[PDB]
Every structure is written in structure tokens, then in C-alpha cells.
Structure 1
């Protein structure tokens, strides 16, 4: 079935689940040709696959070479995503394989179901949550490793840093989605909020700054204000 906010706590029970977001798999710049036409050039992309209970992000880098000589790339991208997620599941020990995969875009359902035929007991589901995972490429260290890749590559991160040492997975996911929604809504201002104190640093193995508990409360407030400010600007409220 489809996921939503009635059964929202279920995301953090002990059944393993994986969100898959394909919005950054096929990425282009749109530029003008010598004959005056407009032409695309692909740039590196990524599959965003996240277990929300543990913070484990499996970031598969999609190198531009996979598109060479291919047609209908937006369609192919969904099948490429499905192929790689299926491969990820097969590479995991059985006790680590998900019981559900939740796709952020309904167009991924048939490609993933077809690639996952060998796993009849893994449920493939859409969700009715509007998740901001498209803004994953606003996280500086994720963007950097994607744009630097010269070959297909799988990179691993805990997208929650060390937060689970102090907060629940429900709370961590809420913090993540708030940060990413802010980055999606006003990227440059959201980055300013995060980097405005140069004495709070990002650990070498972390994605986010080493905020204390009280500093996170302040940051989260500033992020909620950013989002509300942009809503008011957009709708003249």
C-alpha cells in the first residue's frame, strides 16, 4: 500500500525499509548551440537510497557515460535506477535486505517491481509524503563526490551524522527533512544559517555541523522561519 501520515511512525519500527529517490539520476545543463538551437549536456547524477531508521544512505553515483548512445533517457533513468537498487538488495546479506522499498515517484513502481521479481516478499510502495530528497545535491559533501566521479561509484554515509547517539530515528528523520526542505526552498539562505558560526565545524566524516542540543533547537527554528518566510513571499501572505 501507499505510505502517508496515518501510518507514519511505522517508518521507524524494526522492519527494514528503504526510501528510493530517482530525481537526481538524470541531470542536465540546458545550453544554446552554434546554429541557435538549445542542447542538453548530461552531468553526473546519483540514486538516493536511505534506510530512515539507521540513517544509512547508499549513494550510487550515476556517471554520464551510462547515457552515451542511449535514447529516451528520462525513461531509461527509471530502469537504470531500478537495476541498481535491485543490485544493492542482492549485494546485502539476507538479514539486511529490506522488507519494503518506498519510491518517492510513482513512475519508479513498475521498473522496480520488474527488476525485483526475484524478491517476491519485498513490497514496493509509493508514498503520499512530499519528501525533499531532491535537495540531497545541496549537501556540499554529497554534491562534491558526485561531481568529482570519473566512473560509476557507490559511496556510503550516515546522513544523520552521530545524531542517533542523542535522539530517536523519528526525531532525526524530522530534522533531516526540515533541513532538506529548507535547502530546497531557499538553498543559499539555508546554507548561510548552517555556516554562519565558523567556530562550529563539520567533522571530517560528517555532513552537517557539530551543533549542541540547544544549537540544534535554534537552527531548526531558523529553518522553520526560512520555510514560512518563503511561503509568505510566494503567496503574498
Structure 2
């Protein structure tokens, strides 16, 4: 059934699973027309498909051409997401295919279920967790590859960089979700924290800076403070 706080350690067991987040598939800017009406302009989007155990991220870039001449784009986007995830699964060797796919938004359940009818043994699950994967486009290298794409494209990343050499998956996911929650609550402050110290760099083959274990503890503390800071600014506390 649904994934929640109670069954959270299941994310890090040895059954292959993927989270699918569709928030950033259909992205628009709303603007005024010459006549004073409102219109939208689509920009490139992405499906965020993540193995929480290994950090492997399958970033399917959604180019604005896929929406040309289509109607009801917010509904289409869910089915296009499901089409692309099903295509990804079919492209993987059998022993790499997931046993479960967890969708971060319940509106993806029926589209994914229908696209996966050929895979009756792959469980499609919702989650009660409020995960911050919408903030993936706040990671500069992911935003850059999405915006620069001129055609549909799949790009593969490890969203944990090399962290699993030193920490467990559970801890790596906790770090990722804290980073993304912070970037979602106050992007400017979060990026300031991550780069305030010019001596710490991001390796060419990495997404995040090369913090030592001790520096990650400081960074993680600064991110929590930020989240609590924003929480007080928001609610006046």
C-alpha cells in the first residue's frame, strides 16, 4: 500500500525500487498578451526518477516540442510521465527492473498503472511522505541540462555523488531530502550556505560540493536552522 513514516526503512532494502516525481514535467511561465489576456509559455521540464538505495537518477528531459498542438497539458503530462517511466523499465535488463515504483503524487497512480499493465508484478504505490523532489531544478547542473536541451534526452546522474563510500543509503537519503527541503523553502539562502566557502568546490563529475564529514555536519545544521528560520518567518513564531 502507501509508503509512509512507519515503513520508511523499506526504501533501503535490497528490492529495487524507484521514486517517480512528475512535478517538473510540465512547466510554464504565465504572461499577458498584447490584447491584455493571459497566456502560458512552456519551458523544458523533466521527470525525476530516483533509486533511493543507490542514488541513481534517471532524468528524462521533457522538451517543449512534446506539448505542441496538444490540449489539456496538465493531464497529458501525467500520461507522458507514465509512458516514459514504462519505456525506461522496458529498456532495463530484467534483473535491473524495479519491483516497486513509488509515485510522489497520487494523480500518477492510474496513468502509471495503465502503462505498466505488461508488468503485473511491479507494484505501483503512493506515499504519504511530502518529499521535496520538486526542488531538483534548484540543483544547478540539473537545471542547466534541462534548459539547454533541444530535443528529448535521458541523462543519468548519481544524486548522492560519492557519499555512499562513507555513509549508508538511509543517511544519504536523509541528507538529500534535507538539502532539497532547504532549497525549496529558501533557495537563495540554501545556495548561499552551500557555496559561502570558495575553498570547497563541486567536482566536475558531482552535483554537490566536496564537503568533509565534519563540514557536512555543519552544513546539515545550517540547513535545519534555515528551514526553522523560514518556518518562523512564515508563521510568525
Interval of TM-score (by shorter of Structure 1 and Structure 2): over 0.9
Once residues 229 and 63 of structure 1 are traced to their aligned partners in structure 2, the CA distance between those partners, rounded to angstroms, is 37
Q: In structure 2, what is the Cα distance between the partners aligned to 1:5 and 1:70?
A: 39
The TM-score normalised by the length of structure 1 is 1.00
Question: What is the root-mean-square deviation in Å for CA atoms of aligned residues?
Answer: 0.3
Number of residue equivalences: 237
Q: Could you tell me how far 1:38 is from its partner in structure 2?
A: 1.1
CA deviation profile, 1:89-145 (whole Å, cap 9, x unmatched) = 000000000000000000000000000000000000000110000000000000000
Show structure 1 runs of 4+ deviating over 4 A: none
Distance 2:236 2:55 in 1: 37
Q: CA deviation at 1:151?
A: 0.1
User: Any idea what the Cα deviations from partners look like across 1:161-217, whole Å, max 9, x if unmatched?
Assistant: 000000000000000000000000000000000010111000001000000000000
The two structures have a TM-score, normalised by structure 2, of: 1.00
Counterpart Cα distance in 1 of 2:11 and 2:200: 31
**Separation in 2, partners of 1:10, 1:118:** 25
Deviation at 1:3, TM superposition (A): 0.3
SS of residue paired to 2:121 = coil
Q: C-alpha separation between the residues in 2 aligned to 1:31 and 1:7?
A: 43
Partner of 2:228: 228
2: CA distance between counterparts of 1:145 and 1:10?
Answer: 31
Distance 2:30 2:197 in 1: 36
Structure 1 residues without counterparts, runs of 5 or longer: none
Unaligned runs of 5+ in 2: none
1:62 Cα offset (Å): 0.1
Residue 75 of structure 1 aligns to a residue in which SS? helix
